[PDB]
From a paper:
Amino acids (aa) required for protein synthesis are delivered to the ribosome by aminoacylated or “charged” tRNAs, activated forms of tRNAs wherein the 3′-end is conjugated with a cognate aa by specialized enzymes called aminoacyl-tRNA synthetases (AARS). In most organisms, LysRS belongs to the class IIb subfamily of AARS and is evolutionarily and structurally related to aspartyl-tRNA synthetase (AspRS) and asparaginyl-tRNA synthetase (AsnRS). In contrast to its bacterial counterpart, h-LysRS has a 70 aa N-terminal domain (NTD) that facilitates tRNA binding, but the structural basis of its role in aminoacylation remains unresolved. Herein, using a series of high-resolution cryo-electron microscopy (cryo-EM) structures, we provide the mechanistic basis for recognition and aminoacylation of fully modified cellular tRNALys3 by human lysyl-tRNA synthetase (h-LysRS).
To gain a mechanistic understanding of the aminoacylation pathway for tRNALys3, we carried out cryo-EM studies of the h-LysRS–tRNALys3 complex in the presence of L-lysine and either a nonhydrolyzable ATP analog, α,β-methylene-adenosine 5′-triphosphate (AMPCPP), or AMP to mimic the pre- and post-hydrolysis states of LysRS–tRNALys3 complex, respectively. The tRNALys3 used in these studies was produced by in vitro transcription (IVT), and therefore, lacked any RNA modifications. The AMP dataset yielded three distinct reconstructions: apo-LysRS, LysRS–tRNALys3 complex in the “undocked” state, and h-LysRS–tRNALys3 complex in the “docked” state. In the presence of AMP, no discernable density attributable to magnesium ions was observed in the h-LysRS active site. For an identical experimental setup, except for the presence of AIMP2, the LysRS–tRNALys3 complex exhibited an equilibrium between the “docked” (55%) and the “undocked” (45%) states. For unmodified tRNALys3, the h-LysRS linker region (208–220) adopts a significantly different conformation wherein H217 stacks against the A37 base, but H215 and F218 do not participate in tRNALys3 binding. In unmodified tRNALys3, U20 and U47 stack against the double-stranded helical core of tRNALys3, whereas in cellular tRNALys3 these bases are modified to D20 and D47, which are nonplanar and assume an unstacked conformation. The tRNALys3 modifications are essential for ordering the h-LysRS NTD, which remains disordered in the presence of unmodified IVT tRNALys3. In contrast, under identical experimental conditions in the presence of unmodified tRNALys3, almost half of the LysRS was found in the apo-state (no tRNALys3 bound).
Author numbering:
A (entry chain A): 72 to 577
B (entry chain B): 72 to 576
Write the structure that this text describes.
Amino acid sequence: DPNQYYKIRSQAIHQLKVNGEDPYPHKFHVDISLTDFIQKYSHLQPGDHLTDITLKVAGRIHAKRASGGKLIFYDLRGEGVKLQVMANSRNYKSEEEFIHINNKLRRGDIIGVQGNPGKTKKGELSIIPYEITLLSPCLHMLPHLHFGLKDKETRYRQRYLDLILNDFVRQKFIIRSKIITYIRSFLDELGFLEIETPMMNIIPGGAVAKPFITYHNELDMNLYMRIAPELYHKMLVVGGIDRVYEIGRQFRNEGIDLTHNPEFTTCEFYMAYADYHDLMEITEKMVSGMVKHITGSYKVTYHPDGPEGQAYDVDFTPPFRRINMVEELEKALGMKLPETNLFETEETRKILDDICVAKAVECPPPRTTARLLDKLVGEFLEVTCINPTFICDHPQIMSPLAKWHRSKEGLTERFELFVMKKEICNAYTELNDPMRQRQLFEEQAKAKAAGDDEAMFIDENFCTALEYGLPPTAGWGMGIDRVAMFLTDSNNIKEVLLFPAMKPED
Amino acid sequence: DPNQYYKIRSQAIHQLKVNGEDPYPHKFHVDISLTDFIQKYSHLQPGDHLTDITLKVAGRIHAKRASGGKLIFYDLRGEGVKLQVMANSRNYKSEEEFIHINNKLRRGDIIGVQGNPGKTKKGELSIIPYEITLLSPCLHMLPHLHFGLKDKETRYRQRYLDLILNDFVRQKFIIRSKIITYIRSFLDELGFLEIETPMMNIIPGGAVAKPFITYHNELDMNLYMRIAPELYHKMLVVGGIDRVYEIGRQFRNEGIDLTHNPEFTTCEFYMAYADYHDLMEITEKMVSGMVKHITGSYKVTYHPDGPEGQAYDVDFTPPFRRINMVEELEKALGMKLPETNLFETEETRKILDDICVAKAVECPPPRTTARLLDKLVGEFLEVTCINPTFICDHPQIMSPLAKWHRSKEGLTERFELFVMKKEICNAYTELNDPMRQRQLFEEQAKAKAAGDDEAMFIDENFCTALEYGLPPTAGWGMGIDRVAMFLTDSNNIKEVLLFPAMKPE
RNA sequence: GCCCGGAUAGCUCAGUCGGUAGAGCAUCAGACUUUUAAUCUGAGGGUCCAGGGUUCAAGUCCCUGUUCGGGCG
Ligand SMILES: Nc1ncnc2c1ncn2[C@@H]1O[C@H](COP(=O)(O)O)[C@@H](O)[C@H]1O
Ligand SMILES: Nc1ncnc2c1ncn2[C@@H]1O[C@H](COP(=O)(O)O)[C@@H](O)[C@H]1O
Ligand SMILES: N[C@@H](CCCC[NH3+])C(=O)O
Ligand SMILES: N[C@@H](CCCC[NH3+])C(=O)O
Ligand code: NA
């Protein structure tokens, strides 16, 4: 019964509390963890009893078998590993205490065992208890579901239940933490300095992404949540710290879907006296080392549409394949499109749209050249990016805050890393020209951010900082969630998030 | 004058750009870092000139001086280091580009020099330049003062200028980063797991504060920003992860002063099958190891107000002082305050009132015994906690989420680490009882509806999580900003914050 | 808003030609000093999605609907 069981258990616990039987002791001394116990006392043979050694462990019961009136088998489960407890009356303190403690213990209870190691006749590492102490009773029902919980609605809304019933989520979160730690260690070894930029920006920014508007009553003014720490990192680089990095949280006021969250974690770093070609090797080394360290090898098997779908085997050998966008795109399209310098020309946009219509592709109602190309590169180039692949310089239309090409015309010095036909690493070459940056900010604000409103989306403080002299520097960004999904074989962003945002019920 | 200088420099840069030459080169092949350069070539005898290799360094000019018309001395500052360059016509590429680049360069510009290491006979390490390349001109005029900019407004609003002129700011930020790194490493080697709890909640909860309300567009709902990542950690512990930790940002809708900020960073961990007395040693080892590893010794000199005032000396010797709150309060007062058990409602209120009137402690909100006794313990106990000191066994009605004392009654199982008369970290013994927890949450909700503003609402998810069974756990929380303030001899939070949130113009 | 098929113990489903609701899972009680998804025995558990007509007798016919899966606006 869903309701009657809770009421009965609550009444029993209240009765225990009434007659001087506390079910919530303040302290229990866990001498040894379950993992250490299993590692140490696994050398025992079947049917042994190490009566000399007595240790204290604690854990949550996951099963209760009644082989008789005086023999009860519990299954403690902690640290992701199980351990059987064989409660026998003859080895307990007393028969009365044995039958008293066994009555009050059920599945899911948090208990503390104090006993001697050994094994049964069949052979299993078990601790024969001398005195079982209840630590935290479980009032609610714990279902005994084989193969784990499968309803993908209480797994995300009740994460503790998912951790209790399912065991792979702990491995997923451990892998995510290990990824974060590896990134921190690598960037610290390279000499970077970890920083913490403000999350409450006065100016929202000329970005398309909707900001989370917040009101400050003491200063009676509107604060906008952080979208990217880019401007503050570049300000610090102007200040003198040539290498900065930050693995922080960015908030976006967009919808919630399979692979999108209102808040997410991104690792962003900026290094001075470098460029995208300099960061290509760094990204290669970091990604290959992370794949080799988290897993056991460079090979990773991913299921983009669940286990029942197609399994893709990617190889993370350090020599990633590098393809330049325009030379590869023209080949993939099958025809050579007009030169890059004709980006602004309407004729190039019309002919490119003719190509898209000829190849039967779909484009957003805005028919700008940026949309057409981003669609062309996303459905003829990244499709062949099953293995990790570097996409080179992109036209100046898409990336505003990237310097022009060293030799080519109208090409931003930037690169992207595509794995599993998805974008994980983006790296630009910072624009240190104050006049060009000012013009770009003004035009970006006037275009969409301030199309029919006040032109305040420009950051005068950042332009003033750039006026003081920014060294030739290069940035790099990483979406930690995407890498976590790729390394944990997860096709949902909610599988790698501890408490993902969900639509409220009722 | 600064406007005229900006106009002239902007015109000069436009003239530079129009006639082919590019004042913003795309990439400079920096070969060797400035600090490495100094460390490697400090062995040079004054007067040597290694005219056999060429190294390319980069930096920012901060002073120029022409010793005639052929020799020009610059001094680059990079990673907080000094490299004096003596450009001369003889070793340059040729005279014409030499005079051209000397006319083009000014003070504050960011340049890159390719040359040969050496040292003048005076004894100053230098790099003889073969070709000086200008990387980023400085349009504005850098102030020339031999002490660095001192106006607090200019220092905080323009942090890049502070880093450019002042030198201790970089050291302060490095110390803060090392604090965070040491905490992370210690907690990781203890076996903890780093987690990322949501910063947006449907309802407020976690600690007494005023939340930042935000509106969600797609889903018509108000999200309250994170105040403390406390409930989610306990839900995770219920899930099965015994040890968790998180160093993260918390947002508070208070005012802005020299100590408090709208946003700050704190480190919070939770350990299962432990208690506050178990954390009393862990946090002591934390603090002692941090101070030893960062400062270099166990003794710190801290100025409570200004570098010209009294300079207190705080010793972080690992055997800290553990003081009982009630016992020490009685010792300071002498008179025996009636026992915590009775709580003597409407009796001890008068008692504390006579103490505040006689002992002369100001009582702005005289309501409730909580405010009054907090006032007494502030004016009589934490004033002498120069060295780090644990203050344990606080009254129950102080803490709404600390388990009751096992031996005593009416006392909560908690301690606070007071260093330099300020709390840095505190620990709690978690209340795993679901019925008590629901009762206390109901009291908090009643206070929030009428009686309090910082109280939380009823979080039914956490109530269900506690109903599912929470082990006996202990929580610990430290304010990173105050530790950074103490370890960098800073009396203002804005010093340890990269971009402190000042009031607008 | 048009149309198709279901609505059964705490959960998943048989229910047959209408001869009164059962099987499994779950809970509880009992037996079983060596089990491992513990093994049996027993009990409670819905009052047939709601209202009706029909039938000797209606979950097991028909008529109005609500809900669900939806095929469609
Ligand atoms: N709403 C969102 N939810 C999750 N991840 C996001 C969201 N918006 C952006 N990202 C991630 O942000 C990273 C950088 O994206 P971009 O700013 O477009 O370069 C990528 O890894 C994206 O997946
Ligand atoms: N508005 C604020 N700005 C900065 N620090 C604060 C603010 N409010 C509280 N704190 C400090 O942050 C910490 C919060 O409590 P705890 O994390 O338990 O130490 C304490 O050190 C507080 O003094
Ligand atoms: N902010 C960028 C980093 C690239 C360099 C910025 N110019 C990102 O989100 O990845
Ligand atoms: N942030 C709390 C943790 C304990 C949670 C409430 N019992 C502290 O450091 O005191
Ligand atoms: Na049965």
